[PDB]
Paper text:
Alignment of a human Fab structure onto a rabbit Fab showed that the longer FG loop present in human Kappa constant domains forms a bent and bulging conformation that would interfere with a beta sheet packing interaction. In the case of the FG loop, this consisted in replacing the septamer human sequence HQGLSSP (positions 198 to 204 according to Kabat numbering) between the structurally homologous T and V (position 197 and 205 respectively, according to Kabat numbering), with the pentamer rabbit sequence QGTTS (positions 199 to 203 according to Kabat numbering). The resulting mutant is shorter by two residues, with deletions of histidine at position 198 and proline at position 205, and is referred to here as ΔQGTTSΔ (positions 198 to 204 according to Kabat numbering).
Separately to the crystal packing analysis we have observed that the C-terminal interchain disulfide is rarely ordered in Fab structures (in only 20% of the Fab structures in our internal database). This could be due to conformational heterogeneity or to heterogeneous oxidation. Neither the K126A mutation nor any of the disulfide variants (not shown) produced significantly more conditions with crystals. Nor did the disulfide removal (C127A + GEP*) or the conversation of the interchain disulfide to an intra-heavy chain disulfide between Cys127 and Y229C (ESKC + GEP*, Kabat numbering) appear to impact crystal packing or diffraction. All structures derived from Fabs with the ΔQGTTSΔ FG loop on the other hand packed forming a beta sheet between the G strand of the kappa constant domain and the G strand of the constant heavy 1 (CH1) domain.
Numbering used by the authors:
A (entry chain B): 1 to 216
B (entry chain A): 1 to 102, 104 to 138, 146 to 224
The structure:
Amino acid sequence: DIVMTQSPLSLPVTPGEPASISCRSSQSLLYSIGYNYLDWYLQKSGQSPQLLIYLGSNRASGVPDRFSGSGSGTDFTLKISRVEAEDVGFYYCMQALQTPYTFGQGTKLEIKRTVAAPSVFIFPPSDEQLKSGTASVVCLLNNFYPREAKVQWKVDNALQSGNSQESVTEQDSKDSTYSLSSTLTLSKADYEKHKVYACEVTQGTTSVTKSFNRGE
Amino acid sequence: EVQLVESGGGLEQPGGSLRLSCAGSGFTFRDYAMTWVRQAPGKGLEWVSSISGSGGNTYYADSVKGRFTISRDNSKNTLYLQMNSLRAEDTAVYYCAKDRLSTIRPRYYGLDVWGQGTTVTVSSASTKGPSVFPLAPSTAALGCLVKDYFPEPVTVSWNSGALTSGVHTFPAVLQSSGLYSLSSVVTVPSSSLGTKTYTCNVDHKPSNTKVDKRVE
């Protein structure tokens, strides 16, 4: 199997700066003069891969000027002359010289931007859910930067541990921010044994808390 | 536009089998080799299989040889993948892609067109459709909580896809119950909360659960 290795795996770039993603193959991909069997693909979050470049340097249909490929034999470079925020996603090289076709590991393009604090929202369990026997309390962190943020649930000011799970979106293609959702899961019984439900979000040494009283 | 639409993904037991399909339109199907590429959860791309335009030749990754069988029906513009002796490692989104022109020597334009994919989960657990609960509160957030379903995936849209700006649909988390739970939120002008309805459109094909929940 031809082994493809990509450099870097993570590429933080400021919009407007160039980017360059490199691919090495373990065997030469030059089949004939002008025929290097290497392609570049982009996969944006929650989408299919799309072809950027084929045969080392041929830009596919509808791909912007900004993208170009070069190289020969065992070494190849995808270039982005001027990175835009909508370019965020994963980039893979693939050789098609031989079956099995084989991919590089992926390079995640990350956009650098200014810090943005999240708009925070807390959601109590629905009465519909409570009827089942369980309560999920949800905390939304909307449109922040950078990725690092700490979510701490507090129940009647007691710090919770081990009863929450969270997940985060990929960087937004327009504003380059992340969002995060956290769910605190309690039995209905436990939920009804307490009053104040609080989500505290920390970025650096600043902490923002949204809460509600189960009663009111 | 050339388009590829995959179908046939879902849940099956280890040892079991399933067939995937991929319908092509917008091109002369029989002229082109057709390829399957898969993506295990949170991993990169892996080539699975190809088959020439005519079906003269088939090609498989080492790990799928013999238990997977590619096919095509040129008269219905349809590619197939018979997946037998299923393993945990076959859990992935499977994509179909248009491959080389099958001229005395084939002509290669990259994997120029890709399907939207179809998710295959290999697990001894059983199918379970989600509950959908509202997330009720100059900007307001509202959402839906899609709780307790198996396997992946679920899709969420808002107002039948009309509403796109401000939507975050989060990565599902696997709870300790072995079931998934996902949230989808949108930020909306607070002013219009009385003059405009917001409906989440949840689909979980594996359970045939298709739910529209108005959030008040």
